[PDB]
A paper describes a structure:
Here, we present cryo-EM structures of the [name] holoenzyme from the gram-negative pathogen [name] engaged with a protein substrate.
Further local refinement and classification in cryoSPARC improved the density for [name] and revealed two distinct conformations, at 3.3 Å and 2.9 Å resolution, hereafter referred to as Conformations A and B, respectively. In Conformation B, only the RKH loop of X5 directly engages substrate, with its His230 residue interacting at a position three or four residues up the substrate chain from where its pore-1 loop binds. The X1, X2, X3, X4, and X5 protomers are ATP-bound with clear density for the γ-phosphate and the magnesium cofactor. In the X5 protomer (at the bottom of the spiral), the adjacent X6 protomer and its arginine finger have pivoted away from the nucleotide into the LS position, allowing the sensor-II arginine to move closer to the γ-phosphate of the bound nucleotide.
Author numbering:
A (entry chain H): 6 to 15, 19 to 198
B (entry chain I): 6 to 16, 18 to 198
C (entry chain P), D (entry chain Q), E (entry chain R), F (entry chain J), G (entry chain S), H (entry chain O): 6 to 15, 18 to 198
I (entry chain K): 6 to 198
J (entry chain M): 6 to 12, 20 to 198
């Protein structure tokens, strides 16, 4: 894709995403990979240094992705001093919904027709080799499953038992249902 | 493709690619399929243009066969959220989510060119339906909710009953610019 | 594979070993249940009823599952024909294989001691493409099949429909003893 | 697949199990309807009429559908030959399989209790490429086939053409009971 | 496919069902017309003339078309051999299949009521690559074949060459009634 | 390909050679007409109108055709914008390329002496799969496009709609002189 | 393909239809000429000479061509064996197929009325890779084969070598009448 | 492969060499253990018990392993049938092949002097995709199979379960002497 | 490939060019490799640009091409004949098929070849596939024959030969040395130093 | 690959072109040969009298592409010195021997291979087409051997023997043969 170039008056020419980063807007678009997550981490670290007090706006339009990649974003969001506000555009599914709920409490938003989906993790990696190797990877996946449900329950002010029920299979929610659930705080209109 | 470079005269000169030059005139293009990446560029441009001037109209030129519903909804909610009116224009074709975003323009400012083709239809797969019957039931229910949401928003855009959109989006409904104007998808047809 | 040839004493008649066992009223369902493998079972069940409508038919099952419609052709043939169809689980009876195993005549459903029996809700009976109206239709048909299978399984096992709905939600693996306690089989053979 | 061999008592004659069932006037249509599978059905129907023009022919159907022209060769052969062709649905009779099922002699169209019968308008009878003039021709031919199928189905089911046009618009799945109420089959076999 | 075996009473002789029908002077052309499928038809036509030069040969056609040269080997064999070759359209007779259908003995060309008959100008008889001189040669040969086919079709149908040139320009689909009115077939069979 | 860089004297400004020609109001349509290549033409036409609404725009066409909707975005932009869009055929203008060539301002449609101009009815504007109801819809839409193109072509050429319907039935290749006599272009350039 | 079985009256003997025609001294060359298909022809020609060295052998040709060396094994066998080898063109005799057709006994080379006979210089008898020294060798060998084929063709046709060199330069398609006038065949069969 | 034919003196009867050895109560398990290869072993074991329930059956194993469920069908058949099943390792008995080797009748488990016997924990009995709940289920089932195999192996070898858990952790290759000392086989044959 | 950057010397300053843009400044246009819509349109764009810079000075068209599309080559051909400045053509390595056509299309007296260049002329191959129905194949065969005659006629005009000579000589691939092409009439001179 | 930048900022190959060094690396194609021709033409204009240094590390390539370089080398006024780095095989060895006599160099462990040409193009189609392409390949084979014999001051019969199959030579053997004039050490 051709990323448009915009001019900032101060003149400085930016691509439109660097221009929005100047306004403390970080985009997570598409699958969460090592490379896309590290760009988010790099932007979060950079924005904290520019101003540790001003809010960072984390715009999420993602179907999910790697858990470890999403956890690098998650720990960076919680570590850095400035509040990270999260906004759901289009969809926040799987780790995208996790990072959406991971925003600062009171500053988690979704657009009115966005779709938010939460579910237990799939394969974090293949389970081949010997039964001893498969047992190890199964145990690690169960630990990740419990860790995700526990952190989700903390984000949503719900019991761990509620998240274990609701993440068993793909749980699709409107913006209103996610607000009632505890994934987001407000729904934006204008 | 090689995107041509054009020179803007100012108070000096600035070299733009022709799409950045048109963005300076508040023209946003949605060309080809609606994807996460192409929709987020539209959202980024809509957000940028609101800050440049919240009062001036934004011109959203659509030549798209459709695409992802969630991607199109990111554009749709951005269009409705931002303060400036988003005028929409159909070039060549506005099909599926392209027709949805066309009808989503500000009422009175939805346009189409005389030989454009506008097609509305119920959504297809928003994603595969594999796995167990319990998983397939969930994805079928989610697709039906999306189908109802799209028909409901389309009926609101067109000032028609939900029952009308449910009939007309059952199978691919192709419309000329005149038929789309009579239907309620667009307001005017441009000639000169 | 080369199927061995055996000689039946009567004069002599040369059989492949599977036709020789069919002479003893033994029908094998081995591997996936397809239109072709299910119709061979149906053809053998129909043939054996004509040979002797009173003698038991022995249906040996070693199958991971397969098509529901193909398995239903076997299922209805088993219930229709006059002779009792005894079922035996060798190696495994999974999905429609477990359904056909439980479909044997009550009191004559067997499993070998180290066999594995797995029951679960059906997967795709066919793709769900096309328009949302087509996907709704195929989703409704799959749900009807899911309910029909759970209802027939509950009848076979003398259990409530609610029990089968819980237990077939995800792949439910059972030993021969667990399947006997569940109600899928009646006896476990040893010698 | 290995087709079992069975012995007919008469001296003795060794048959594969399908030739043995053909001796009992049982013709199988299993799997997709192709030129080759349909011509085998036609060859068997013609052969059975010569053997005995008065005795019923039993046409066992377990088919997801197939070619319309191939199914029409079976259909016209069924109507042409003197002996009644009874039809039985095993597992499934979908698309042209449901058409041939309903095409059986009125009063002798059967289905097994858990069989699935699906009727729908035809899909591509062939690709629609080339120029718009070629595409117009193939679209017109497909519409003529669509009307011909709905008209013959309405005749089989004693229903109005308007009913079949509604009900074949999208995949219409029916249980054996629903197909009996619809008019596709006459009876449901149990024992 | 498994071709069924049938027993002819005479002692007994076991035939596959197609060899049994060849004994009744029935030759099948099923599927595409290839060098191998056409030569089998030629071999059967030559064999049947030797068995009885006076009795009619019944040529059952269910074919979408195929090679022109392959179809011409059948065509010239049909016209050469002394016995009349009656032709019957089952399912479909398209392209060279419709040509061979119309090539039957006048008065003995039949079609089943729901058969589909399609006539059209030939497509590529072979690729047109190489140099412009090679392409000119292959284009001229294709035009000669096109004229030869239209001329022979016009002779079969008792129509003017100009009529066949119009009607074979694009795929011309015909019902059995339209083909009878056109002149491709003489009668439509019902019972 | 490496696009050469040229220097414009004014100070100096470095352009790629296509941006340099756009400065002279020359827009190129080279290769197939796609959504992306058509939108670049539209973007250039819109940009050039704003630079000068009164000066002619020179639209150089070397295209085998492409998407109808993509070509219609160019077509409506050409007719909408105030400045005359002169069209020139280089190498070839086929299908939508010939349509856009004839779409130039009357009196300003040009072709080079050895250019090739081809007009024809549209092919597939999209696949025709799915159910017969879907195929009927896409066939009707293609026929509407076919009539719209022939009607607009007849308007461009000052000919009757019946003439364009004959001449676009199959690929109609024309020299620059034949296209001038037909009405697709107004003049042929030499020097 | 399923090759039909026919019964020869003598007791009875069951043949496949090609072995039955070989009993009548009919040898078929159908499809491309390969090492395996040519050696079968050679084996049949050698066998038929042993059965009766005086009776004619009928060589039916329906072939697009093939290997030159494979065709030469047939050619030398035809000329070596004592009985005359009559040749008949069915459908087509192209390339080495036309060579073997013209290679029949003078006065006994036939073609059916709508057969197509094509003569041309050979293509690659094998790839020409490796070094320029290897390519020179293979080019020289191909030229020797080209001259040998034209020389033998000119002998068969009672024409000058210069005539065959002109006429085999590019694909030369001939009707049965043109091949008779050329000298490739002696008679055209009708009835 | 071409399986040789041998003649048994009795009159004479022609066998393939494997059916001839089955007459001597020799059953071969060669190559991977699949549903089809295991069911042939089961069919042969069942057949041999019927022929003589008292005489030993000789089970020759040359297998790298295979499916656990397939191997369990053989295993339960070996233990169920009345006659002792002696096992012999030729070349190799690995994974389920070593399990079935150790499964022979105690005192009658043999290996050739240079055979290789390998025991190890099972690998994937099936993929572990889907959701974490599905992966947990398949992991639990694999662990149950792992424990069942080690428990049965420990019983065969007269060793503690803890010994087999250590030794099957990774691929444990053993000579015939090491397998005899371990308890997998009883004797090593030389002459 | 990495295209080298060269520095053009001007008044107290330096303009950096890639080496092909630097040669275009000297009115040198390259046609290298197959003739496609994109490569031919670049040649046309350069020919149009060079006419505007100076419609009197010769344009040097360096050709190293095995051939390509006829319509693409015709866009170059008509541009060469239209624009006012003479287009001199030079054969480097090879000028085959449409490459030889464009070589012979240079201004008479200014068509050159290097001493070991190879020039090949032949009738066109497929200008496009010939599928579909026999009516479609007849149309495409007729169009190919018209192109074949047009190419031979223009070649005969370039070479001052009879149309019958070009019809013989383009029947199959006719390879020529620079000397044979000069004697034939495809080029005027052979450069050495 | 990332081409380093050296100090105006040049990539390292444009910097060496400023020193009149032209590289032919890898197979000889239409595009790689035309870059060499463009550089040779450019350098003649920058200075028609100064030597051009043509560094060759090539396994061979197209004959017509190599001939465009060859004729450009002989045409332009400045001497083109050639240096073999790593290897000069097939047309690479031809262009190496094509350097100005007395200025053809090779590095001590370079490998130089001469051989008759392979396919200059496929030989499909009809026997008449194959005869034409075989004749053209033989003319190219004779032209290459004749030009090689001229470069090496040897008889045409010597090159016809020695190029029959792949003839690998050390730098010393190529110097004795006549392909190069000197071997560089320091």
């Amino acid at each position: 894709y051709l990323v448009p170039t915009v001019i900032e008056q101060s003149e400085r020419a930016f691509d439109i995403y660097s221009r929005l980063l100047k306004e403390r807007i970080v985009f997570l678009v598409g699958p969460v990979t090592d490379e896309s997550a590290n760009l988010v981490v790099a932007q979060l670290l950079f924005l904290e240094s520019e101003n540790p007090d001003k809010d960072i706006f984390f715009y999420i339009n993602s179907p999910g992705g790697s858990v470890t990649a999403g956890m690098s974003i998650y720990d960076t969001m919680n570590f850095i001093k400035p509040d990270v506000s999260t906004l759901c555009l289009g969809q926040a599914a799987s780790m995208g919904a996790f990072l959406l709920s991971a925003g600062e409490k009171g500053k988690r938003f979704a657009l009115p027709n966005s779709r938010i989906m939460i579910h237990q993790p799939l394969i974090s990696g293949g389970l081949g080799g010997q039964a001893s190797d498969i047992e190890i990877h199964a145990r690690e996946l169960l630990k990740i499953k419990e860790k995700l449900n526990r952190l989700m329950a903390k984000h949503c002010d719900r019991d761990l038992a509620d998240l274990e029920r609701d993440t068993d299979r793909d749980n699709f929610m409107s913006a209103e249902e996610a607000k009632e659930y505890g994934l987001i705080d407000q729904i934006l209109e204008n």
